[model samples]
Target: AVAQSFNMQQQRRFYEALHDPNLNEEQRNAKIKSIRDD
Candidate 1:
């Protein structure tokens, strides 16, 4: 399998939100955009 590269800034935000119990789907979507944006 190929390794997936992600955007640093966005992934940071994702880990930030995901690390918390308040994370939502929208937050994850934003992260997906960051990776796709690359």
Candidate 2:
């Protein structure tokens, strides 16, 4: 349960970053890939 909760938080972070307008396409993709790699 604890790990599941942590995973959800990480997913939320990814989702927010995915839609953030401040980041360019390349930066967003790199951030997402980094999260996935983690």
Candidate 3:
């Protein structure tokens, strides 16, 4: 498989938050965007 830029913990959190039931689509995408910007 190819390498992932984020560590396992971050990757886990990313998906967990990405699919979090509480976040709307915009918020979810923005969360990922902020992490990308960081």
Candidate 4:
């Protein structure tokens, strides 16, 4: 959805991590870790 309309790499990756079905737990956890660390 948001990824399909992406004009920015950052936003695309953000929603991809949150919404993409292919994303595994490790990847999702990594994104959570990244956001937490930020």
Question: What lDDT does the true structure give each of the candidates?
Answer: 0.54, 0.74, 0.68, 0.59
List candidate 3 segments past 4 Å from native.
1-4, 7-9
Positional deviation of residue 25's Cα in model 2 after best superposition, in angstroms:
0.3
lDDT of 4 at 5: 38
> lDDT tens digits, residues 1-38, model 1?
11264554346655665565565678666655554565
Off by over 4 Å in 1: 1-22
Better of 1 and 4 by lDDT: 4
At residue 38, candidate 3 shows an lDDT of: 61
Clash count, one per candidate: 0, 0, 0, 0
The deviation in Å at residue 35 for candidate 4 is: 0.6
Model 3 agreement with the true structure over 1-38: per-residue lDDT tens digits: 12356555357667776887799998988887766556
Q: Quick one: best lDDT, which candidate?
A: 2
lDDT of 1 at 38: 52
List model 4 lDDT by residue over 1-38, tens digit each.
22433445346556667785676878886885564344
Instruction: Give me the candidate number with maximum TM-score.
Output: 2
Error of 4 at 28 (Å): 0.5
TM-score of 1: 0.36
Q: How are the candidates ranked when ordered by lDDT, highest leading?
A: 2, 3, 4, 1
Off by over 4 Å in 4: 1-20
Task: Please list all clashing residue pairs in model 2, or write none if there are none.
Answer: none
